[PDB]
Amino acid sequence: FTMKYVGSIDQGTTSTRFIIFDERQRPVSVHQVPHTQHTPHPGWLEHDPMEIFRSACKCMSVAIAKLRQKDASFRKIEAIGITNQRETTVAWDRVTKEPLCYAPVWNDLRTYDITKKVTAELGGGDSMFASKITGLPVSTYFAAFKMRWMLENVPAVADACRRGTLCFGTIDTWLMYKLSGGKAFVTDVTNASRTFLMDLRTRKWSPELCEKLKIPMETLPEIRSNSELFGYVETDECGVAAALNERTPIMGSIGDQQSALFGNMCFEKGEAKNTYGTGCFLLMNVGEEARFSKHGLLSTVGFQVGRDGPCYYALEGAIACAGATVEWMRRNMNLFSHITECEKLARSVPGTQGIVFVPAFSGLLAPYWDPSARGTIVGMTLKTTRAHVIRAALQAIALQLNDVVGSMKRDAGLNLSSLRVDGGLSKNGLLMEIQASLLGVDILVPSMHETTALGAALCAGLAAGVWTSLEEVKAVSRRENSWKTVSPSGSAMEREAMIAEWREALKRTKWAK
Amino acid sequence: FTMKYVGSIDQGTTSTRFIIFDERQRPVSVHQVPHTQHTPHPGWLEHDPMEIFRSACKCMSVAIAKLRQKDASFRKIEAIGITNQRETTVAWDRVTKEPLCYAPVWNDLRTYDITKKVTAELGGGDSMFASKITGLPVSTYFAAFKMRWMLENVPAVADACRRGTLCFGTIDTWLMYKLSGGKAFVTDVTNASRTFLMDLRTRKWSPELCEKLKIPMETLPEIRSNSELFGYVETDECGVAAALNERTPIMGSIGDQQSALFGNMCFEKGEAKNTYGTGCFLLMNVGEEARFSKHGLLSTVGFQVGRDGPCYYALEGAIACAGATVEWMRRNMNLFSHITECEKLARSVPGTQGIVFVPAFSGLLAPYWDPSARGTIVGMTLKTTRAHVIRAALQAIALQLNDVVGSMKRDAGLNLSSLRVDGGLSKNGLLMEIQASLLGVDILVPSMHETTALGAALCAGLAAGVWTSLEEVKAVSRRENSWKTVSPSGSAMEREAMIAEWREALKRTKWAK
Numbered sequence A, B: 001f002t003m004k005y006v007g008s009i010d011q012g013t014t015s016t017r018f019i020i021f022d023e024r025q026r027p028v029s030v031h032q033v034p035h036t037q038h039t040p041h042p043g044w045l046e047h048d049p050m051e052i053f054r055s056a057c058k059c060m061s062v063a064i065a066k067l068r069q070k071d072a073s074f075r076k077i078e079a080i081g082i083t084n085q086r087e088t089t090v091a092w093d094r095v096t097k098e099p100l101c102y103a104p105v106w107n108d109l110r111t112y113d114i115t116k117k118v119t120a121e122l123g124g125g126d127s128m129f130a131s132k133i134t135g136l137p138v139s140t141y142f143a144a145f146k147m148r149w150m151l152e153n154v155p156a157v158a159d160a161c162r163r164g165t166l167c168f169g170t171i172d173t174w175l176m177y178k179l180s181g182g183k184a185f186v187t188d189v190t191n192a193s194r195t196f197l198m199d200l201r202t203r204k205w206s207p208e209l210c211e212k213l214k215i216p217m218e219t220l221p222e223i224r225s226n227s228e229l230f231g232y233v234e235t236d237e238c239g240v241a242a243a244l245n246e247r248t249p250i251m252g253s254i255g256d257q258q259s260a261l262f263g264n265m266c267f268e269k270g271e272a273k274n275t276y277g278t279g280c281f282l283l284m285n286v287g288e289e290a291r292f293s294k295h296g297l298l299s300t301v302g303f304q305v306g307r308d309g310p311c312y313y314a315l316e317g318a319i320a321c322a323g324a325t326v327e328w329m330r331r332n333m334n335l336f337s338h339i340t341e342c343e344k345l346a347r348s349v350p351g352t353q354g355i356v357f358v359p360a361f362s363g364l365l366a367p368y369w370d371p372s373a374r375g376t377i378v379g380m381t382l383k384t385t386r387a388h389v390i391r392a393a394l395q396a397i398a399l400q401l402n403d404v405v406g407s408m409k410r411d412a413g414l415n416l417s418s419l420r421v422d423g424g425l426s427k428n429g430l431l432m433e434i435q436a437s438l439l440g441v442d443i444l445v446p447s448m449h450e451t452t453a454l455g456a457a458l459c460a461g462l463a464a465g466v467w468t469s470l471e472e473v474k475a476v477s478r479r480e481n482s483w484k485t486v487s488p489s490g491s492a493m494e495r496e497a498m499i500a501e502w503r504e505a506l507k508r509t510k511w512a513k
């Protein structure tokens, strides 16, 4: 036949992208368009759903146009996948086809008072009351609470609910609705699991929770899998229908973290990925049955290939200050000037020589949620240098994931098979070695680092028959796009002593108030 | 018609100085010569006693010569005083007049085992067992224990004992021997009070403690006051006898910290001085009656002018890492480039904004004595910067001073009417201010900073009639050498709160072992 290509809309917190992959899973064209970060009051954050929609469209037409110019064999896009900042929630009207307000972002803290109210007046003091249904604690992040808040506080949303015309939806749902010309009102299992309205075990809306939270099941879209025919692109808001040329289907939708889980090929229980960004997000595949957490971790859907096909579940954990710690050392503390020196300063010394640096700046998340913990350094002497402090910060990040992973191993009754990394800090070689050594598993660094975008591309491709099974997907990746591999290179005396030092250090962190 | 001159040899840890003062207490010639800091094993420090002797002689020869050029009539120095790093101990031979080995320094930790063996076998587990005799706990610093080591470890010293030719002394005794040709084997009360071998109230060698620790009294110098004839300079080591031109008497000997107390005119009880340098010490004049300590602090002789003169006593508190702390931030952490950036960055913020830096790099001294304490910072957030960390360090220093003064008031039964400062960090205004605001008293700063050297010249000039009395001495100082006063400026609640913050941070310093 001819060459095939799959497009991936990568819709993030600070920008939107379109990446076209070829059938070897190589990114052959990209365009990025940012969008405005609206901040009406301290701790609020909101996005313009229409601005986001036009960025997607822009990106699609620019990347397309750039590829035609450099690839004589590119004829059309076979299918489009979507991946998105999760939890961000949009309200819009079924007949005007427009938003009723801006979109509160995942990390938006306006829903706080609703969240304290729900914990008390519905869970009787327990934030975990519905964690066996949803997999989730009561929290400001999850969508129901933002939905509730827009019902309570946006007269326009209240009204349209009463007309029977209101649509709520995560960014996947919204993007798919407009791309479709308003014909498709859908969502995938991974986005739907971050709403607080889906029953993990069935992956359907929960009549009980919707009732109990007073969100009407008329407002919610149809839950579908990650990989299947969602709709077609039927708009032309920035040249896009012209650019795609043929009608082009939408056949992949997956929340960003799960999209990275998928794009890093974590198809089997025990396989986990970590993104080393500003924070860390670690996800492990735990298998075909939902596993619930007794360490404060999130249970979520990992991925679902095919409608009502197999559903792999996952456990998710975070740390707030990974990349942010490195940036803090530089710009607040002058411990170095630009990012290259971070790793070389940390390599200049054989170890931390006693010190521990717990970068608990905005508390400890992970499996020891403690908002009172603060940034603390212990063990220093006159022989202590910035080299050691920088190295200890690398150890700290790796120690936290280790704790997170330890908790996941216990909640799930599995061992960690391998950890794939992506993110800025995955380019710090030393941090990968300290991590491999602590976890006692191989760490895998793909050199094609666009793993989030690839997840959604893989979903669309499987469904459109560009790739014909997960095994073919792994073969192509392992052959074409080369992984760097990083084996444990440390003794069990050192491992055990580093974790013991860390354990002792964590006791000394309590400070705020 | 012509100016009368007094000489001071200032034999410090890292160098030797000779200062010549006029009868108006102005330094008119100075010369300085550094000596080698030998460190055979880790935590060991050791000096070459011939190097030290010869350094002092070069200092006298050159300072003398530089003065003749400024003043061609100067025919002689009236008298020469000695002040010296204390506790540092020389072993020598009565007839060869030469060191048997190198001299272990005040902060040398080779005596550690011997320090334990003593606390148990002689002291029944109590380190304060001779507190009421010596004014001291059992510790690595004091000269007896170094004496003991050289008998158990140095063939030449163990041996020279047998023949009746072994001499031991502190650096005063050693300089003063060699300066005199061998004709003088003496020590002053302040230096003697640091041997662990002298009764504080009586200023006698204690036959009980000698006996107990296996130190034969045959090796020990005759104790004198700080102000009287010790001997004459009768050597030509660098033309020194010649340069002096006349037989010049040594009429001053005083341990370095006491010398600063004396040189800052701290004659009344409640008057205290805080010195920064190769080590950092606060000394309070407590009066004619000796006071002992319930809160770590050391009891010692302040000074005694003359054989039949009254003995004024003092309490002594140390801190271990003071100027070292600033240089550590500079040289190890790169928090600033040069010394003037420190006070500025610290000034650029309103406060510590919730952080505390306990700079206990080598344990907590003062009234806490915790050798397990290490350097620790607590409270940090992403809003913490180097300005806060540097400011915090300065607060820690004042906070430690404050806790040391607290202990001193309780022990002595007095308030601190005045604190005079000198050494390095006295040039930092912000620190002086933070210090004044915590002790709630005045801080005096000499423009004629050379006050340690002054003390021994004052001793030697009092004995030789250059000044006739303590009153004339203080009258001239006031007349000649200008002050700078720093007054408190804060609340009771600022103070109370900063101290409670500090007291909780201390709980989190235990780390070593």
Ligand SMILES: O=[N+]([O-])c1ccc(OP(=O)(O)O)cc1
Pocket (backbone or CB within 6 Å): A012, A013, A014, A015, A085, A277, A278, A279, A280
């Ligand atoms: O890890 N984070 O806190 C985080 C994650 C995503 C962000 O934005 P994005 O990288 O454009 O999706 C910004 C910050």
